[PDB]
Amino acid sequence: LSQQWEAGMSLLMALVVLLIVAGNVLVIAAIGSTQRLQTLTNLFITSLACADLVVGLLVVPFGATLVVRGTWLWGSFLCELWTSLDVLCVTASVETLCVIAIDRYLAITSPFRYQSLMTRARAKVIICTVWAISALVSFLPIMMHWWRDEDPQALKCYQDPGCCDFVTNRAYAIASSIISFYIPLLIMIFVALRVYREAKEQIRKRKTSRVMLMREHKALKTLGIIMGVFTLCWLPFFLVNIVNVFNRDLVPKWLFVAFNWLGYANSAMNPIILCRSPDFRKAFKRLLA
Numbered sequence: 001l002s003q004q005w006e007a008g009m010s011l012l013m014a015l016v017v018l019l020i021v022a023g024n025v026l027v028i029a030a031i032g033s034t035q036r037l038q039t040l041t042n043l044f045i046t047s048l049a050c051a052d053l054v055v056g057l058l059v060v061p062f063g064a065t066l067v068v069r070g071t072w073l074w075g076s077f078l079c080e081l082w083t084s085l086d087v088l089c090v091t092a093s094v095e096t097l098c099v100i101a102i103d104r105y106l107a108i109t110s111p112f113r114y115q116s117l118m119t120r121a122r123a124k125v126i127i128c129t130v131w132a133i134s135a136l137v138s139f140l141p142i143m144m145h146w147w148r149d150e151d152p153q154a155l156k157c158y159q160d161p162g163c164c165d166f167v168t169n170r171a172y173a174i175a176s177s178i179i180s181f182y183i184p185l186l187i188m189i190f191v192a193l194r195v196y197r198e199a200k201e202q203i204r205k206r207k208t209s210r211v212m213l214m215r216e217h218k219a220l221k222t223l224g225i226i227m228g229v230f231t232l233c234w235l236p237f238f239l240v241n242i243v244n245v246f247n248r249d250l251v252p253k254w255l256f257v258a259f260n261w262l263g264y265a266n267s268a269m270n271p272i273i274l275c276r277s278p279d280f281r282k283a284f285k286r287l288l289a
């Protein structure tokens with residue numbers, strides 16, 4: 001009966017990996033094969049799809065083995081590398097979303113300046129910077145062991161290569177959460193709501209025709225959906241992360257795990273959301289025979 005749960009979960013995990021990996025490869029292949037999707041924003045979408053792809057290839061497969069076997073198989077170094085890459089992908093995702101929000105805000109409020117100053121290459125640089133900042137805030141604190149807690153339970157986990165629970169001290173939990181997630185999220189949300197306001201003002205009445213603006217507004221809607229779904233998927237984990245460093249009894253392990261998997265599920269969601277934007281849909285239809 002533990003074998004039918006081990007087999008039951010193995011098959012389900014393999015399908016999660018397939019969906020994440022194939023969906024995000026399909027997004028990247030749509031953008032790379034279609035003139036109409038060669039927009040700056042979609043370059044930023046590429047960054048997201050990449051973080052999702054690292055989630056599907058590296059993070060979920062290690063994680064599934066933890067989930068179904070109930071112990072860590074891969075030794076102490078890969079435990080730390082896995083954790084670091086998990087933390088990095090979440091960080092780079094929320095920083096890219098906050099950049100998309102700011103970029104669009106500047107695009108709609110200064111279309112002339114924006115289109116005369118932004119390039120495909122200058123976007124690729126912003127993206128690079130994002131991943132460099134994300135890797136710094138992610139990798140460095142892990143590497144330096146600034147996260148370690150001094151409780152015996154924590155110390156027993158750290159001595160056991162078969163334990164890979166991210167048991168951290170309070171200081172690290174709060175500070176890493178602020179810097180990796182809560183500040184870029186709050187900024188993304190504030191700025192996105194202003195983009196939404198300004199778009200609304202504009203269609204109501206730019207020299208642009210109202211039909212052209214409505215088409216601009218459909219593509220902005222896509223990005224807003226991705227942002228709201230990212231918020232719904234990750235905010236519970238981050239709220240619970242903080243409750244739990246203050247009282248470990250408030251959040252049982254299996255529940256903590258469930259919240260973390262709702263975050264990982266975000267990486268399946270974007271390609272599916274993109275399926276309903278018209279330009280992406282067309283491209284997916286062509287690509288899949």
Ligand SMILES: CCCCCCCC/C=C\CCCCCCCC(=O)OC[C@H](O)CO
Nearest residue numbers: 098099100102103104106118126187190191
């Ligand atoms: C009118 C006065 C109202 C003031 C209220 C605003 C308060 C803070 C709001 C946003 C912070 C903006 C932080 C800027 C950090 C983003 C850096 C960046 O790289 O932006 C992406 C780039 O612009 C892509 O083209």
Ligand SMILES: CCCCCCCC/C=C\CCCCCCCC(=O)OC[C@H](O)CO
Nearest residue numbers: 188189192193196221224225227228231232
């Ligand atoms: C609870 C999640 C909070 C976090 C949120 C993050 C920022 C998202 C900002 C705005 C929503 C974007 C979608 C805006 C949709 C407006 C489109 C509309 O007009 O509604 C139906 C339309 O009329 C039919 O064509």
Ligand SMILES: CC(C)(C)NC[C@H](O)COc1cccc2c1CC(C#N)=N2
Nearest residue numbers: 083086087090166168172173176177180
């Ligand atoms: C298996 C684990 C627990 C590894 N999953 C990590 C989670 O997906 C991402 O969690 C985080 C992302 C960024 C910053 C973070 C963070 C957790 C903490 C803490 N203290 N700081």
Ligand SMILES: NC(=O)CN(CC(=O)O)CC(=O)O
Nearest residue numbers: 074075076077078160161162
């Ligand atoms: N045996 C090894 O290769 C690594 N070891 C030690 C470690 O990962 O810290 C794992 C173990 O002792 O179970």
Ligand code: NA
Nearest residue numbers: 051052089093
């Ligand atoms: Na992501």
Ligand code: NA
Nearest residue numbers: 157158160163
């Ligand atoms: Na361990």
